[PDB]
Coordinates of C-alpha atoms in Angstrom, one line a residue:
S1 CA 79.6 163.4 59.4
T2 CA 81.7 162.3 62.2
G3 CA 85.4 161.6 62.9
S4 CA 87.2 159.6 65.5
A5 CA 91.0 159.6 66.2
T6 CA 93.2 158.1 68.8
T7 CA 95.4 160.4 70.8
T8 CA 98.7 159.1 72.3
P9 CA 100.9 160.4 75.1
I10 CA 104.3 161.6 73.7
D11 CA 106.2 160.2 76.7
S12 CA 105.9 158.3 79.9
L13 CA 104.7 161.4 81.9
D14 CA 101.8 162.3 79.5
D15 CA 103.6 165.7 78.9
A16 CA 101.4 166.1 75.8
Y17 CA 99.3 164.0 73.4
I18 CA 99.6 163.6 69.6
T19 CA 96.9 162.7 67.2
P20 CA 97.5 161.8 63.6
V21 CA 96.2 164.3 61.0
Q22 CA 96.0 163.8 57.2
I23 CA 97.0 167.0 55.3
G24 CA 97.0 167.4 51.5
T25 CA 96.7 165.1 48.4
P26 CA 98.1 162.5 48.6
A27 CA 97.8 162.6 52.3
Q28 CA 100.7 163.7 54.4
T29 CA 100.2 162.4 58.0
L30 CA 101.5 164.6 60.7
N31 CA 101.2 164.0 64.5
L32 CA 99.6 167.2 65.9
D33 CA 99.0 168.4 69.5
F34 CA 95.2 169.1 69.7
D35 CA 95.0 172.3 71.8
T36 CA 91.6 173.5 73.1
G37 CA 93.5 176.6 74.4
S38 CA 94.5 178.0 71.0
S39 CA 93.1 178.4 67.6
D40 CA 95.9 178.0 65.0
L41 CA 96.5 174.8 63.0
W42 CA 100.2 175.1 62.3
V43 CA 102.8 172.6 61.1
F44 CA 106.5 172.0 60.7
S45 CA 107.0 172.3 57.0
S46 CA 109.4 172.4 54.1
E47 CA 109.6 176.1 54.8
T48 CA 110.8 175.8 58.4
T49 CA 114.3 177.0 59.0
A50 CA 116.4 173.9 58.7
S51 CA 118.3 174.3 61.9
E52 CA 115.0 174.4 63.8
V53 CA 113.8 171.1 62.5
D54 CA 115.1 168.1 64.5
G55 CA 113.2 164.9 63.8
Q56 CA 109.7 166.2 63.1
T57 CA 107.7 165.1 60.1
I58 CA 107.1 168.1 57.8
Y59 CA 104.3 169.2 55.5
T60 CA 105.5 170.0 52.0
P61 CA 102.8 172.0 50.2
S62 CA 104.5 171.7 46.8
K63 CA 103.8 167.9 47.0
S64 CA 100.1 168.4 47.6
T65 CA 97.9 168.9 44.5
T66 CA 95.2 170.5 46.7
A67 CA 97.5 173.0 48.5
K68 CA 97.1 176.7 47.6
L69 CA 99.1 179.6 49.0
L70 CA 96.8 182.0 50.9
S71 CA 98.3 185.0 49.4
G72 CA 99.5 187.7 51.7
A73 CA 98.6 185.8 54.9
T74 CA 101.0 185.4 57.8
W75 CA 100.7 184.2 61.4
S76 CA 102.6 184.5 64.6
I77 CA 101.7 183.0 67.9
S78 CA 103.1 182.9 71.5
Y79 CA 102.0 180.5 74.1
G80 CA 101.9 180.6 77.9
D81 CA 105.2 178.7 78.4
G82 CA 107.0 181.3 76.3
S83 CA 107.2 179.2 73.2
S84 CA 106.4 180.6 69.8
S85 CA 106.2 180.0 66.0
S86 CA 105.4 182.0 62.9
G87 CA 105.1 181.7 59.1
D88 CA 102.8 181.8 56.1
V89 CA 99.6 180.1 55.2
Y90 CA 98.2 177.5 52.7
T91 CA 94.7 176.2 52.4
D92 CA 94.5 172.4 51.9
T93 CA 92.4 169.4 52.7
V94 CA 92.7 168.2 56.3
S95 CA 91.2 165.0 57.7
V96 CA 91.0 163.8 61.3
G97 CA 89.8 160.4 62.0
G98 CA 87.8 160.1 58.8
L99 CA 86.3 163.6 59.0
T100 CA 87.4 165.8 56.1
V101 CA 87.5 169.6 55.8
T102 CA 88.4 171.2 52.5
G103 CA 90.0 174.7 52.3
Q104 CA 91.4 174.5 55.9
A105 CA 94.0 177.1 56.7
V106 CA 97.2 175.2 57.3
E107 CA 99.8 177.5 58.8
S108 CA 103.3 176.7 57.6
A109 CA 106.0 177.5 60.1
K110 CA 109.0 179.4 58.9
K111 CA 110.3 179.8 62.5
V112 CA 109.7 177.8 65.7
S113 CA 111.2 178.4 69.1
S114 CA 113.6 176.0 70.8
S115 CA 111.0 174.1 72.8
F116 CA 109.3 173.0 69.6
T117 CA 112.5 172.0 67.9
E118 CA 113.6 170.0 70.9
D119 CA 110.3 168.0 70.8
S120 CA 110.7 165.6 67.9
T121 CA 107.4 164.0 68.6
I122 CA 105.1 167.0 67.9
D123 CA 104.8 168.0 64.2
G124 CA 102.6 171.0 65.0
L125 CA 99.4 172.1 66.8
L126 CA 95.7 171.9 65.9
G127 CA 93.8 174.6 67.7
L128 CA 90.3 173.9 69.1
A129 CA 89.6 177.1 71.0
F130 CA 87.3 179.8 69.4
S131 CA 88.3 181.2 66.0
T132 CA 88.4 184.7 67.4
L133 CA 91.9 183.8 68.8
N134 CA 93.3 182.7 65.4
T135 CA 96.4 184.7 64.6
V136 CA 96.3 184.8 60.8
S137 CA 96.6 188.3 59.4
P138 CA 95.1 190.2 57.6
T139 CA 92.3 187.7 57.3
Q140 CA 91.6 185.7 60.4
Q141 CA 91.0 182.0 59.7
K142 CA 88.7 179.4 61.2
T143 CA 89.6 176.3 63.2
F144 CA 89.2 172.8 62.0
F145 CA 86.2 172.4 64.3
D146 CA 84.6 175.6 63.2
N147 CA 85.0 174.6 59.5
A148 CA 83.6 171.1 60.2
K149 CA 80.8 172.1 62.4
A150 CA 77.9 172.5 60.0
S151 CA 78.7 169.1 58.5
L152 CA 78.8 167.3 61.8
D153 CA 75.9 165.1 63.0
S154 CA 76.0 167.2 66.2
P155 CA 78.2 170.4 66.7
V156 CA 80.4 168.9 69.3
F157 CA 83.8 167.3 69.9
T158 CA 84.9 165.2 72.8
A159 CA 88.2 164.7 74.6
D160 CA 88.9 161.4 76.3
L161 CA 92.6 161.6 77.3
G162 CA 94.2 158.6 78.9
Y163 CA 96.4 158.3 81.9
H164 CA 99.7 156.7 80.7
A165 CA 97.6 155.3 77.9
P166 CA 96.0 156.3 74.5
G167 CA 92.7 158.0 74.4
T168 CA 90.3 159.5 71.8
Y169 CA 89.1 162.7 70.2
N170 CA 85.7 162.4 68.6
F171 CA 84.0 164.9 66.3
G172 CA 80.3 165.1 65.8
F173 CA 79.0 162.6 68.3
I174 CA 79.0 161.5 71.9
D175 CA 80.2 158.0 72.5
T176 CA 77.9 156.9 75.3
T177 CA 80.0 153.8 76.0
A178 CA 83.1 156.0 76.9
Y179 CA 81.9 157.3 80.3
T180 CA 80.1 156.2 83.4
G181 CA 77.1 157.9 84.9
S182 CA 75.8 161.0 83.4
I183 CA 77.4 164.1 81.7
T184 CA 77.1 167.3 83.7
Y185 CA 77.0 170.4 81.5
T186 CA 78.2 173.8 82.6
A187 CA 78.1 177.3 81.1
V188 CA 80.9 178.6 78.9
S189 CA 82.1 182.2 78.4
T190 CA 83.7 182.8 75.0
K191 CA 84.6 186.4 75.9
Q192 CA 88.4 185.6 76.0
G193 CA 88.2 183.1 73.1
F194 CA 88.6 180.0 75.4
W195 CA 86.4 177.2 76.7
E196 CA 86.1 179.2 79.9
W197 CA 83.9 177.9 82.7
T198 CA 83.5 178.0 86.5
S199 CA 84.1 175.1 88.7
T200 CA 82.0 174.9 91.8
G201 CA 84.9 174.0 94.2
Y202 CA 87.4 171.4 95.3
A203 CA 88.4 168.7 97.8
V204 CA 91.8 167.4 98.8
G205 CA 92.0 163.6 99.3
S206 CA 89.2 162.4 101.5
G207 CA 88.7 166.0 102.9
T208 CA 85.5 167.9 102.8
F209 CA 84.4 169.7 99.7
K210 CA 85.0 173.4 99.6
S211 CA 82.3 175.3 97.7
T212 CA 83.9 178.1 95.9
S213 CA 83.8 179.4 92.3
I214 CA 86.9 178.8 90.3
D215 CA 86.9 180.4 86.8
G216 CA 89.2 178.6 84.4
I217 CA 89.7 177.1 80.9
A218 CA 89.5 173.6 79.7
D219 CA 92.8 173.3 77.9
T220 CA 94.1 170.1 76.3
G221 CA 97.2 171.9 75.2
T222 CA 98.4 172.5 78.8
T223 CA 100.0 169.6 80.7
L224 CA 99.2 170.5 84.3
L225 CA 96.4 171.9 86.5
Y226 CA 96.9 175.5 87.4
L227 CA 94.8 176.8 90.2
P228 CA 94.7 179.7 92.7
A229 CA 97.6 179.8 95.2
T230 CA 95.2 179.2 98.1
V231 CA 93.9 176.0 96.5
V232 CA 97.3 174.7 95.6
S233 CA 98.7 175.4 99.0
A234 CA 95.9 173.4 100.6
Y235 CA 96.6 170.5 98.3
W236 CA 100.4 170.3 98.9
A237 CA 100.0 170.9 102.6
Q238 CA 98.7 167.3 102.7
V239 CA 102.0 165.9 101.3
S240 CA 104.8 165.6 103.8
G241 CA 107.9 167.5 102.6
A242 CA 106.2 169.2 99.7
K243 CA 107.3 172.8 99.0
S244 CA 107.3 175.5 96.4
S245 CA 110.7 175.9 94.9
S246 CA 111.5 179.1 92.9
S247 CA 114.6 177.4 91.6
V248 CA 112.6 174.5 90.1
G249 CA 109.7 176.7 89.2
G250 CA 106.9 175.3 91.3
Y251 CA 105.8 172.8 93.9
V252 CA 108.0 169.7 94.3
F253 CA 107.5 166.8 96.6
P254 CA 109.5 163.7 97.9
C255 CA 109.4 161.0 95.3
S256 CA 108.7 158.6 98.1
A257 CA 105.3 160.2 98.8
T258 CA 101.9 158.8 98.1
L259 CA 99.9 161.7 96.7
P260 CA 96.3 162.4 97.7
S261 CA 93.5 162.7 95.1
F262 CA 92.1 166.1 94.0
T263 CA 88.4 166.6 93.4
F264 CA 86.9 169.4 91.3
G265 CA 83.3 170.5 91.1
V266 CA 81.2 170.6 87.9
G267 CA 77.9 171.9 89.0
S268 CA 76.7 169.4 91.7
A269 CA 78.9 166.7 90.1
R270 CA 82.5 165.9 91.1
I271 CA 85.5 164.7 89.1
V272 CA 88.2 162.9 91.0
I273 CA 91.8 163.2 89.9
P274 CA 93.7 160.2 91.4
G275 CA 96.9 161.1 93.2
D276 CA 99.1 159.2 90.7
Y277 CA 97.9 161.6 87.9
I278 CA 99.6 164.5 89.9
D279 CA 103.1 162.9 89.8
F280 CA 105.3 164.3 87.1
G281 CA 108.4 162.4 88.3
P282 CA 112.0 163.4 89.2
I283 CA 112.8 167.1 88.5
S284 CA 116.0 165.8 86.9
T285 CA 117.2 162.2 86.1
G286 CA 117.9 160.4 89.3
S287 CA 116.6 163.0 91.6
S288 CA 114.4 162.1 94.6
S289 CA 112.6 165.4 94.3
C290 CA 109.5 165.0 92.1
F291 CA 107.5 167.7 90.2
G292 CA 103.9 168.3 91.1
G293 CA 101.0 168.2 88.6
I294 CA 99.0 170.9 90.4
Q295 CA 100.7 174.3 90.3
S296 CA 99.8 177.9 91.1
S297 CA 98.1 180.0 88.4
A298 CA 99.3 183.2 90.2
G299 CA 101.0 185.3 87.6
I300 CA 99.5 183.3 84.6
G301 CA 96.4 185.5 84.9
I302 CA 94.0 182.6 84.3
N303 CA 93.2 179.2 85.9
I304 CA 93.9 176.3 83.6
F305 CA 92.2 172.9 83.7
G306 CA 95.0 171.2 81.7
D307 CA 95.5 167.5 81.0
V308 CA 96.0 166.5 84.6
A309 CA 92.3 167.5 85.2
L310 CA 90.9 166.7 81.8
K311 CA 92.3 163.1 81.6
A312 CA 90.2 162.3 84.7
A313 CA 87.0 162.9 82.7
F314 CA 85.2 162.4 79.5
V315 CA 84.9 166.0 78.3
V316 CA 82.3 167.4 75.8
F317 CA 83.1 170.6 74.0
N318 CA 79.6 171.6 72.8
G319 CA 79.8 174.2 70.0
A320 CA 76.1 174.8 69.7
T321 CA 75.0 178.4 69.2
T322 CA 75.4 178.8 73.0
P323 CA 78.5 176.8 73.7
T324 CA 78.7 174.6 76.9
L325 CA 81.1 172.1 78.4
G326 CA 80.2 168.7 79.7
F327 CA 82.1 166.5 82.2
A328 CA 81.5 162.8 83.1
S329 CA 83.5 160.4 85.1
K330 CA 84.9 157.4 83.2

């Protein structure tokens, strides 16, 4: 089997991407944030505290003839931006782009933090990291991909995120028309539960490539590119007036600037992030200070190849017995 679904930016800045997901019988379609950095499929639901729902579409298990309470199971998750959610668990039928999993754990939110409430466009998350990170207790549950894997034509999914445009998530096949040149594959460590890999270095604009190992994660659920302070300083030093602002919470730059590109290494291959991808616009409405899309990972504890990086490539998440990551230009 295979599946193919379109993923769409939630706003004009590509702050996140939503992908329609069919849950239950008859189908209830929710727009979920596919997140290769976590491993819980959770939704706004009929159980979510009413004051914490503001415009989201909810899953109502009592209206699904295939929903079954997973008795005794609870979940609770916290993300790197300080947001969180928690609740109980149902199993139900879940389909993405024509690919159907029966008995998928659907984590029903009883509580969500303010950031989720305030984002009316995201109805929940669909985790695509390794199932070892799944938070369901006392019986850990598998991700949608893990459950689908054996049925897929090939044990892979691909992320093809657009810049200010829709893109695609495919399951079970590689669309050879969706990228240019060849795909360069690179080793993955699953020791921390992530799609963790090591970039071979970077360049700023038309500058020379610096060979240096940068360990990080391929994370579709993180907006920006978070790299070591040395790398980030080298980037922003090429932008007149750019500075790190503790009051804003990162690097800002004059909105009048033309940003240089940023290149990252994948083995001997190179992915180029155009300067425009690094512009996240005014820090507040009307401001002439703009927020940068490359930020320091210092104090996160991990480097994160988020959407800013991933949307510059066609990315293969290879879930074979020894997982790997592939990157191609597009």
